[PDB]
Amino acid sequence: GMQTSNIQTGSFNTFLNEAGTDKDTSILLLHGSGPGANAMSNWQYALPFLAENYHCLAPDIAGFGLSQHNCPPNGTSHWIDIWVQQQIDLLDAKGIEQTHIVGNSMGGGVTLHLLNRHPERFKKAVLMGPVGAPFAPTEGLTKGWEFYKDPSKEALEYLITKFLFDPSLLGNDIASIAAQRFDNVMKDEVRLQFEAMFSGGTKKGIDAFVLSDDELNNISHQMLVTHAREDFFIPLNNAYYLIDRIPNAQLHVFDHCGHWVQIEKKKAFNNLTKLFFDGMFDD
Ligand SMILES: [Cl-]
Ligand SMILES: [Cl-]
Ligand code: NA
């Protein structure tokens, strides 16, 4: 019920997950920036659900998973340029003129820059704990983006655990999950490019995603910003900041919830997202 492909997007190949390929309206889903992050780790629950009615495209974002960049630069601002062009190159490669879009954290930041730079290519947007607002580094985002200063199974287990408000939702054994996720995290084909993305440090990485008030004011897309009240990585105040500045943005905040809203509250998030794209919360 799901297809994968490797598709040329500019100077490198993008690993792509797709579902609902027979559907007329598409959703592009952009994952977050946990160490070892990829499309499926973020979206494996949302994809089958949304694919009942939507054509879903969920790529590994450049530098992550199986979308290694051919000449990785250093500096977050330069990776944002790459991440934006990657999605445009993907849509062009699939012959898709306009798409709905969902973005988690880093992917939500990329979403904001996509709406700013290429507004004609996008319909509705859902953000989930997005970067893009100004904030001081959190304990979570620091330990995440600077993981490779001191990498270990234990450090990765801690991160994975902190992405959820109730870690037991993950399964009965998080140590085992960290153990199996760790080998992938330590490959040079995963580590080197992650280090390059946030080489300027957490503060420079956060600041790099921030759009100006004028830019945000001029994002005209119908939008839903979702956020976990207890998000340990991106402060809830970011969501409030964004909805204060983006004209057509609604807000939804989930209680007893960690950064990974889509994993902690699978049914609620999946339904809220789908019904938003369906038009249930239109004016
Ligand atoms: Cl992630
Ligand atoms: Cl993240
Ligand atoms: Na454009």
Side-chain angles (χ1 to χ4, degrees), residues 88 117-121:
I88 299 301
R117 292 178 204 188
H118 302 279
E120 69 290 350
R121 301 306 292 276

Side-chain angles (χ1 to χ4, degrees), residues 32-34 105 163 259:
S33 53
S105 176
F163 277 113
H259 184 65

Side-chain angles (χ1 to χ4, degrees), residues 32-34 104-106 141 145 163 233-234 259-260:
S33 53
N104 165 20
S105 176
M106 178 274 300
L141 198 61
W145 284 0
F163 277 113
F233 293 77
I234 313 302
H259 184 65
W260 284 345

Side-chain angles (χ1 to χ4, degrees), residues 76-226:
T76 310
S77 71
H78 310 299
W79 278 93
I80 290 159
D81 290 341
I82 283 167
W83 292 329
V84 169
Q85 192 61 50
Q86 177 189 21
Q87 304 318 315
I88 299 301
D89 290 343
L90 176 58
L91 296 177
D92 286 351
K94 300 302 280 186
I96 293 169
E97 179 55 29
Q98 296 196 306
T99 188
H100 292 312
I101 183 166
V102 181
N104 165 20
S105 176
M106 178 274 300
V110 176
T111 297
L112 284 171
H113 290 263
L114 275 162
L115 303 178
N116 182 49
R117 292 178 204 188
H118 302 279
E120 69 290 350
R121 301 306 292 276
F122 302 94
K123 288 151 67 65
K124 288 179 144 86
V126 170
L127 307 181
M128 196 200 74
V131 296
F135 63 94
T138 52
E139 180 175 10
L141 198 61
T142 297
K143 281 166 178 180
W145 284 0
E146 308 184 15
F147 170 83
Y148 291 107
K149 288 183 177 56
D150 274 271
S152 64
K153 280 178 165 149
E154 170 64 33
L156 185 62
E157 181 180 332
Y158 175 83
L159 284 174
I160 292 165
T161 299
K162 287 294 180 177
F163 277 113
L164 293 159
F165 178 86
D166 174 10
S168 78
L169 283 178
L170 177 61
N172 50 340
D173 209 349
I174 305 159
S176 174
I177 292 210
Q180 307 181 34
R181 290 192 195 188
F182 184 68
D183 263 90
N184 186 67
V185 169
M186 295 308 285
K187 308 208 282 247
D188 298 325
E189 321 86 64
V190 173
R191 167 177 193 170
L192 288 169
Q193 308 204 356
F194 187 91
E195 293 178 320
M197 293 168 191
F198 308 110
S199 60
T202 298
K203 172 168 165 48
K204 284 212 161 86
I206 294 164
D207 305 351
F209 278 103
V210 177
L211 289 168
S212 71
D213 291 350
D214 284 344
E215 286 172 324
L216 292 168
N217 291 166
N218 284 280
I219 291 176
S220 303
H221 304 80
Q222 304 293 326
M223 184 184 288
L224 176 60
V225 177
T226 66

